[PDB]
Design a protein around this ligand. Structure first.
Ligand SMILES: Nc1nc2c(ncn2[C@@H]2O[C@H](COP(=O)(O)OP(=O)(O)OP(=O)(O)O)[C@@H](O)[C@H]2O)c(=O)[nH]1
Ligand SMILES: Cc1cn([C@H]2C[C@H](O)[C@@H](COP(=O)(O)OP(=O)(O)OP(=O)(O)O)O2)c(=O)[nH]c1=O
Ligand SMILES: Cc1cn([C@H]2C[C@H](O)[C@@H](COP(=O)(O)OP(=O)(O)OP(=O)(O)O)O2)c(=O)[nH]c1=O
Ligand SMILES: [Mg+2]
Ligand SMILES: [Mg+2]
Ligand SMILES: [Zn+2]
Lengths: 550, 651
């Protein structure tokens, strides 16, 4: 209803028909118009825009930035560091059509906690002329606040400086949360898709950042209201924060308490077999950038076939979802199960080939864009973009993103077309695993054939919940169990209308996480005890990403 | 059909010119929006799908007839269906004192100066997302004054916690000024007090600096409409307001980034006698600092509160507020001061929409009438008809905007508009929209008083009288329209950026190249002496002064100055003095800065080739197009780039 939202609606309504013509191939357009492929962000296709990125904030925070005429010097405080993080996210959100993430929020904001502490001790020195130079690089335990009742001497000055640092970090974290939840910067709804990942920083500064962000989340925004953005994600590592002996276990417990009330942060299990990296050393200051980072849109970019297995500075180029329920409904007419399965697999093969060709064509369209079209993404944020002239193509660096082949309604793909759904039957579970494994193998073949990074995606429900189901119900009527819910069940998820305990849901949904390298989530609807149990079952059965709601 | 195929091909070519990022008349319409970016491409697609829609469905047959015939230029056509209003002056005090709930974002009242500055930036961005024009903060010093005191009290209580003293008397104690002083030679209570000031000033130096950066960054990037920002200051004779103004001026002088010129926000100095203009006034030193900063960074511009048309009889020097009755400008040129059914105040109100009139075509159409009296009578008949058309268009847009509900603009119609607090989210804005203004514009007066009707007003006296009577007739017609349509109509010296060359192109296509009127790719800005005419600054001021009293919807006095006179700050004081003498309201001094794109080193010479710091291949040029600064010369319209190339310094 806002003028900006109306402008973006007009732009989308004048772009989607345009991309449908002269840009989509004949086969691609035929597949899209026949309710087979949903090309996500079909608007912004003419812009040659990429989907998402994990911002390397060290570059921006240490060298400033110069985007157009907007130039910022290197940060000297937490107050400026948080604002620069917000600025980077907002600026890159206007250059891309997907989420923006901070892979290491605790690692990126941590030197500036020490710089703020040094400013406090230097202000106390100029107030007192006491030459407190031994407190500059001294090791701090946790940056905690104490009443200061009877701590006279240099102890009083040290504790007062720590108190001021804690207050400054608290104000900066409140500012970051409120700016990401209040500033309406992008187009349309205007709220930036913001995510931050933290949990694996054991230093006192990172612990202070995490503690203050958790306290600010716990206190809410404004008058105790829960914050919608940024999507907070807690990185779970055994030996760092999971076991009671671990360094950041207490903060982890605190995180659970916050999830008990504000339902944030989410949890990213770095102990999953697919999320492990052989170059993660617990001592290296750069032990991040070798660990998995996830967005609120569930986009996972970890493995690269011609580079490093990292999530920083990389992202998704574009992803499109495949309607497998439609193929299953089409093959429903075969009475023999074996022939019906063979027909479904042939249809899936054809649609997978079409989707791969569509993603390749969109890649060829995007690669001709010049670096001048993305002032911040292709100058500080992408992998290798610092070696790009403004008037040269991005083809030398675009072959590092991920092409996503998404799917939806596996439970609906099985509820009545080929028997029962995977929540209630073991045969259905085996069939669903077979389908997703076939998709993953074909994605690997596509990656070899087209020289790209293809990954299977458990597409988030937002923006696609009812688009497929309405057309399927129009074409095929009300199929009992399939086209009768007004929404397709989320990908490889137990249907919400099926009453199963969290243990059974986790056991059913665990295998699909390894197959969906492009993204996945565990969803529990329901006290820190229950959150602890959810994380425990995420640990017991290999699961990448998880969240608890109400 | 062949016509349908041709139209489809034309639309496809327009939509692919945006995709391929080529310098065109559609990808350079606005020099603030970057067309290369995906957000710029989306905005251009929205503009191209909205302008034909409003032309073919929303306007009337008379309005379409005028627009297609190169007589009327409706401004911000792309935003017509959105029912958006043009501009507003922010009443920042209510936002800072009670917080705001916009969308899902809730903010509680600020407790320190940095929070206040960030909330000001947030309010400007949010209202920009709800409007299609510039965003200005009046009484910036007044609105940010209490939070300097709040920060001082926080520093005092921190020192009290550290030391255990009783600093209660240092909570509301009067302070002459917030000046940072070295703590070399004072011990005990006094030292502590000074320390608080030396911290408070620092807490104000970042908060202002951040502001200057944020408005230069959230404008450099825009998903919605770019953030056109401006602030007004100069009349707060208190320690906190003086501190705010001093920090703003110092941060602007230092620059943004690697000592570069902040393109935004546009800063305006509120010049007034008895407060900040005379040497015996309180803020004269800050006025001199403003002139010094304007010498280098071309900011702030100067607004004359002593002008006869900018005087309010409810202004008390002892009144705590004292700012509700002072005039502020939206930065580019907008002036919203008078109100026929309300209080004379610029606070929480602004322009609704405006449209420009092509007097040049009306004058050149009267080419064959050899008798000057009949020629002028015919010209005035055409002017009256077109003025009636423009008033009808403005009233039509007003009637369309009235139906907008309060939830279309969340922040604007709950905190930012006069009387918008007494509204439900679903109720319309009829009870409060009438406090806005409707602007009627004109262009090419210098190229309208020419060989068709003689020679231009920069070189003839009866030409000056003819121009004055033309503008006076337009002003009287606007007053009649205000009394007729029950609105607030005003004549506005419309800025010429996208309209610089839009009329002249069609006039060359139709009539051709007439020496002095259509021999250049642009029209001389409204009631301005030609930029291609060698005139002194004093003569230009004398010629253009009487127009400001007539054009009460907005005006500006531009002075191009050479690089040698750029350094000297007394020339800007001379410009302000000649504004004061010749009853001029708003003015600005301009000059071309040679900036290295890689570095940002902005030289002051007329022309530079390479960057002395680095040695870059080429150096771009920075100047103000019509009402705002623009970074690179490759963002200008070719019509306006021709005007820039032919500019002559006045010194
Ligand atoms: N929000 C916003 N408004 C602008 C900007 N630039 C110009 N304007 C509007 O433009 C008005 C000044 O007139 P011009 O900019 O010369 O209008 P124009 O060049 O003819 O552009 P259009 O009328 O839209 O075709 C101001 O009152 C603003 O409302 C901008 O960058 N952002
Ligand atoms: C605080 C803040 C800074 N910035 C920008 C302005 C600065 O150029 C950059 C770093 O800010 P600062 O930390 O203030 O850098 P500085 O050079 O001013 O350091 P010092 O005060 O010690 O001399 O970040 C913002 O864009 N927004 C903000 O809110
Ligand atoms: C500093 C800052 C605050 N805010 C928001 C967060 C707050 O909800 C609101 C006002 O914050 P404050 O008034 O500064 O914080 P507070 O009310 O909690 O004061 P205190 O700590 O003494 O109790 O402004 C931003 O959105 N951005 C910012 O940069
Ligand atoms: Mg606070
Ligand atoms: Mg600073
Ligand atoms: Zn240089």
């Amino acid at each position: 209803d806002t003028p900006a939202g109306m402008m973006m609606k007009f732009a989308s309504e004048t772009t989607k028909p345009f991309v449908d013509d002269y840009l989509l191939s004949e086969d691609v357009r035929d597949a899209v118009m026949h309710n087979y492929i949903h090309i996500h962000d079909k608007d912004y296709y003419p812009t040659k825009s990429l989907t998402c990125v994990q911002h390397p904030l060290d570059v921006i925070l240490n060298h400033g930035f110069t985007a157009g005429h907007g130039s910022s010097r290197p940060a000297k405080r937490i107050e400026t560091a948080a604002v620069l993080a917000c600025i980077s996210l907002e600026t890159c959100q206007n250059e891309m059509h997907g989420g923006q993430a901070i892979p290491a929020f605790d690692f990126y904001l941590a030197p500036y906690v020490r710089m703020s502490y040094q400013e406090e001790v230097k202000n106390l020195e100029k107030l007192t002329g006491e030459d407190l130079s031994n407190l500059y690089d001294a090791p701090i335990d946790d940056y905690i606040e104490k009443p200061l009742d009877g701590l006279q001497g240099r102890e009083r000055l040290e504790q007062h400086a720590i108190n001021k640092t804690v207050n400054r970090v608290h104000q900066a974290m409140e500012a970051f949360i409120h700016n990401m939840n209040t500033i309406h910067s992008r187009g349309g709804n205007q709220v930036v898709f913001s995510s931050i990942n933290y949990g694996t920083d054991t230093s006192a500064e990172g612990r202070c950042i995490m503690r203050e962000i958790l306290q600010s989340t716990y206190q809410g925004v404004g008058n105790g209201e829960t914050a919608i953005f940024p999507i907070q994600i807690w990185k779970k590592k055994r030996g760092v924060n999971y076991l009671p002996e671990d360094r950041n276990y207490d903060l982890y417990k605190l995180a659970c308490k916050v999830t008990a009330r504000r339902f944030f942060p989410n949890f990213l299990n770095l102990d999953a077999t697919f999320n492990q990296n052989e170059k993660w050393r617990a001592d290296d200051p750069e032990r991040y950038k070798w660990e998995i980072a996830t967005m609120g849109c569930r986009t996972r970019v970890f493995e690269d076939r011609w580079g490093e297995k990292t999530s920083i500075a990389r992202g998704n180029l574009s992803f499109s979802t495949i309607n497998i329920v439609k193929l299953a409904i089409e093959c429903m007419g075969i009475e023999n199960e074996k022939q019906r399965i063979d027909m479904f697999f042939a249809k899936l093969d054809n649609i997978l080939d079409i989707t791969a060709k569509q993603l390749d064509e969109r890649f060829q369209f995007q690669k001709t864009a010049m670096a001048k079209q993305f002032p911040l993404l292709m100058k500080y944020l992408w992998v290798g973009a610092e070696n790009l002239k403004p008037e040269e193509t991005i083809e030398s660096v675009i072959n590092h993103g991920t092409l996503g082949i998404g799917f939806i309604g596996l439970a609906e793909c099985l509820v009545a077309l080929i028997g029962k759904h995977h929540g209630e039957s073991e045969k259905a579970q085996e069939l669903g695993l077979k389908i997703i494994t076939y998709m993953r193998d074909r994605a690997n073949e596509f990656s070899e054939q087209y020289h790209h990074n293809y990954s299977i995606l458990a597409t988030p429900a937002e923006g696609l919940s009812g688009k497929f189901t309405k057309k399927d119900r129009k074409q095929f009527g009300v199929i009992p169990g399939v086209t009768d819910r007004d929404y397709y069940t989320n990908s490889n998820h137990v249907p919400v209308y099926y009453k199963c305990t969290a243990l059974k849901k986790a056991q059913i949904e665990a295998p699909y996480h390894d197959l969906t390298r492009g993204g996945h989530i565990f969803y529990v609807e329901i006290n820190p005890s229950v959150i602890e149990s959810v994380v425990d079952m995420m640990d017991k059965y290999n699961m990448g990403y998880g969240s608890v709601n109400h």
